[PDB]
């Protein structure tokens with residue numbers, strides 16, 4: 521694979537970063553990151569050569585990206601931004617991300633841990649490499665929590681102190697906006713994203729990001745309830761799955777004004793249906809809940825929930841009194857079908873009579 525060419529080219533290549541951590545944690549990963557002492561670009565192009573695949577070079581970044589099957593390989597030259605592996609490693613964020621495993625033939629299968637990344641790994645501890653790490657790259661403030669959210673890891677004393685410092689220093693607000701938005705977009709893709717929100721509330725990061733944002737108990741409660749509803753729905757219908765991460769985000773921004781909220785969602789590069797759910801949540805949701813509680817017949821609820829998005833209904837299952845109604849619509853009302861002969865007798869305006877018969881049968 522690599523070590524052959526690394527030996528033939530006299531270079532030294534290493535599997536580096538999150539991939540190594542995932543391997544140690546027994547995680548399946550098809551995305552592989554390499555750091556090389558040598559010329560990594562030529563090594564990558566020669567790998568792509570021998571394998572006969574296509575290689576995208578990046579002279580500016582001094583890196584190369586090549587894909588074999590659905591497996592993606594990124595090769596990078598060791599750099600301090602020559603530079604030894606250690607110097608390339610210490611510039612990264614955390615200890616568990618700071619390790620490497622050699623693919624070179626002599627040392628193959630050797631985990632190289634300078635900073636005790638394995639020590640901090642087994643202790644479930646997120647730890648920065650250097651004391652200025654948060655000031656250096658503010659994104660890490662969020663990142664740590666995310667990892668701490670994902671793996672259920674605790675922040676070390678030093679790390680927590682530095683993090684709280686950098687947060688109180690407000691460096692988060694003066695951080696590059698794009699990278700922050702990216703980190704947030706990556707955070708919501710987590711299944712542990714709710715716990716990440718717990719850490720967010722704990723260290724108050726969102727208050728330093730979004731305009732006029734604060735925390736109250738009702739939002740948190742509706743977030744737990746949201747987790748319940750999401751778990752139940754994901755349990756019942758496996759083919760109806762959507763992205764639930766945005767729903768929590770819509771819960772958080774619920775109390776905020778429409779203008780800045782819309783601007784924020786457009787700033788997040790959010791999907792259509794999400795922002796549509798937001799606009800529908802602001803204005804039309806109140807009268808929706810009103811007329812929903814005012815519905816005597818099941819068919820009326822069917823008519824009301826028919827044009828609605830599924831996410832809107834899932835969001836509507838948060839109400840206790842509306843639970844059985846939503847569950848009824850999902851598991852019964854919308855599954856109703858008809859025979860042939862009846863349609864033929866109706867044909868001797870069509871959809872009207874169809875909805876009429878729907879009204880007839882769905883009330884049983």
Ligand SMILES: Nc1ncnc2c1ncn2[C@@H]1O[C@H](COP(=O)(O)OP(=O)(O)OP(=O)(O)O)[C@@H](O)[C@H]1O
Pocket residue numbers: 536537538539553611612613614616617618657659660663
């Ligand atoms: N903001 C950052 N500061 C320093 N190093 C970083 C930063 N972001 C990523 N890295 C380094 O890049 C490597 C992989 O990048 P990435 O941000 O995808 O993290 P990851 O471990 O791959 O997370 P995931 O497995 O969830 O994708 C990490 O091991 C880390 O050392």
Ligand SMILES: [Mg+2]
Pocket residue numbers: 538539551
């Ligand atoms: Mg990765």
